Amino acid sequence: SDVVMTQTPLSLPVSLGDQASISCRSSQSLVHSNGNTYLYWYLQKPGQSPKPLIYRVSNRFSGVPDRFSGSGSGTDFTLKISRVEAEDLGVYFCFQGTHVPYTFGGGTRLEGGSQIQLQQSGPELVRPGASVKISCKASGYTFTDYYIHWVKQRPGEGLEWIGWIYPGSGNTKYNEKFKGKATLTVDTSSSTAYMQLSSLTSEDSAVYFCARGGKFAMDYWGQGTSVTVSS
């Protein structure tokens, strides 16, 4: 009964100047009881963290040019990129934050806030059964004004939302998939968020991102921390 986000097409080869349109469909209505529709779009360029494009269906994040337009309602959503150029190449992901657990679309391959820094700890290489505690040092903004989200990304397997913590209060919310094996904490005095991953298996090998956000979605992302679990 988790919400499934389906994107089409999977791959969209295009030439410069053309129009590009990407579809996202949810298995459930994304209208929240509060009246908002927590549908978001992100772009991930081959070598870095996702970047926020659209919030709440139709709003562009700061620095995102008005040639990006999101539309839709209920269960059907569209991202249109009108005058496509070099820097638009990458994987587009839709994301829903209406229903816990928050879920991502599988991505579409097409072929802002740089004061905010989220500095994550280095790569881990461990044996099965180990635990790791990865950190995320926030700067360039007030740590306790925002949520911190954590996200898992396996190679060619897309994105999974792990949970959030609200640094101001320590309050947490987890994806059932991860609750019990990922523990979120903060140190507000050092503006640092932590995620402890426990009883590691080979399936837990992935890149883990910390990201700033609101209660329903990420905005800016850290650079990721690779965890490799190997015998």
Spacing of C-alpha 83 from chain mean position: 25
DSSP 108: E
Token pair, residue 229, equals 């679990």
3-state secondary structure of 21: strand
Residue with tokens 């507000």: 188
**CA proximity to 36, closest of 185, 214, 209, 169:** 214
Q: Are 26 and 38 in contact (CB under 8 A)?
A: no
Cis-peptide into 123, omega within 30 deg = no
| CA-CA-CA-CA dihedral for 79, 85, 90, 95, to nearest 10 | -20
Q: Are strands 158-166 and 147-154 parallel, antiparallel or unpaired?
A: antiparallel
**What kind of experiment solved this structure?**
X-ray
Q: Are 66 and 57 in contact (CB under 8 A)?
A: no
**CA proximity to 28, closest of 48, 3, 6:** 3
Q: Are strands 124-126 and 225-229 parallel, antiparallel or unpaired?
A: parallel
Could you give the domains of the chain?
A: 1-115 (2.60.40.10), 116-214 (2.60.40.10)
3-state secondary structure of 213: strand
Q: Say which residues have a Cβ less than 8 Å from residue 66's Cβ, sequence separation at least 6.
A: 60
CA separation for the pair 96, 58 (Å, rounded) = 13
